[PDB]
Design an enzyme around this catalytic site. Sequence first.
Site, PDB file in Angstrom:
ATOM      1  CG  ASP A   1      -2.498  -2.536  17.005  1.00 30.03           C
ATOM      2  OD1 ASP A   1      -2.220  -1.476  17.605  1.00 30.03           O
ATOM      3  OD2 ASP A   1      -1.725  -3.500  16.948  1.00 30.03           O
TER       4      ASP A   1
ATOM      5  CG  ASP B   1      -9.839  -8.448  26.713  1.00 26.04           C
ATOM      6  OD1 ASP B   1      -9.616  -7.550  27.565  1.00 26.04           O
ATOM      7  OD2 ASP B   1      -8.941  -9.170  26.224  1.00 26.04           O
TER       8      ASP B   1
ATOM      9  CE  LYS C   1      -6.727  -7.171  24.696  1.00 21.69           C
ATOM     10  NZ  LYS C   1      -6.107  -8.099  25.689  1.00 21.69           N
TER      11      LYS C   1
END
Length: 279
Positions: free
Chosen positions: A78, A119, A121
Amino acid sequence: MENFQKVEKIGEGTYGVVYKARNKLTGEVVALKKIVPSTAIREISLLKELNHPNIVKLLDVIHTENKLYLVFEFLHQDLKKFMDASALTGIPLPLIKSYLFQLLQGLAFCHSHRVLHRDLKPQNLLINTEGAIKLADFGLAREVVTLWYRAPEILLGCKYYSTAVDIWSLGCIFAEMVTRRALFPGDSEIDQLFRIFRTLGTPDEVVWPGVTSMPDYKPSFPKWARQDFSKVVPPLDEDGRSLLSQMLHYDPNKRISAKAALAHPFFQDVTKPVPHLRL
Ligand SMILES: CCc1cnn2c(NCc3cnc(N)nc3)cc(-c3c(F)cccc3F)nc12
């Protein structure tokens, strides 16, 4: 579930643990999310059709024993971990630019289908060796949950916020890739708002018509002046700073759309470099 072999716990999503798993049959390696109201079921089933190269593919939805398992395509890393890993030298601008461009394509697609992420992030922006980056947990919205990337209209109590909230989040992430530090690392809802105000200036009716009428707006908010982007994201070039400034407009109606952002001069020389990933 008996169809999958759990390889390892890759993290704690907002709804449950996410596991790296293997399909006991096909040998396929996947990410298995353990999350049931029928409303959720139909909404999630809808996501199975929302397919795009920059959206992590939802392979299957499994409802059993009143339990819900989401089977997704697996990505090894990620953006949060990658940024941590590129801390000493910083992610190269060409790579930052490529990532932002791909994410804007992904948002342009979702938004065109009236689907919001809500959301975004670094933890849910997943990358591969091919230089691709993908939005994860898309549409699932409709440990402390981070507020760092929350749009001001959400913080001010707007109930019916728009696709503009995802543009705000991505702008915050864009700034963070560039500077190697979170843009607005708030640790409470008021701290988040005030961090935004301290940098972009306390919003008023001039820059954001209707702001003073928002549910959580208080006339007693301190009035801070706006800072120059030259001080905020040095040493980003003027094209990048211009784009960032539009993604961070207070008025959601004036905030640049994903589609318009893709046409910005910043992307004139966009390329697709390969990141150096260490799996
Ligand atoms: C389910 C679709 C999904 C597919 N891959 N993946 C990843 N992969 C990157 C990765 C791989 N191995 C490790 N060890 N760490 C990260 C993380 C999350 C995720 C998560 F685990 C928590 C929060 C948000 C996320 F997006 N969801 C997913």
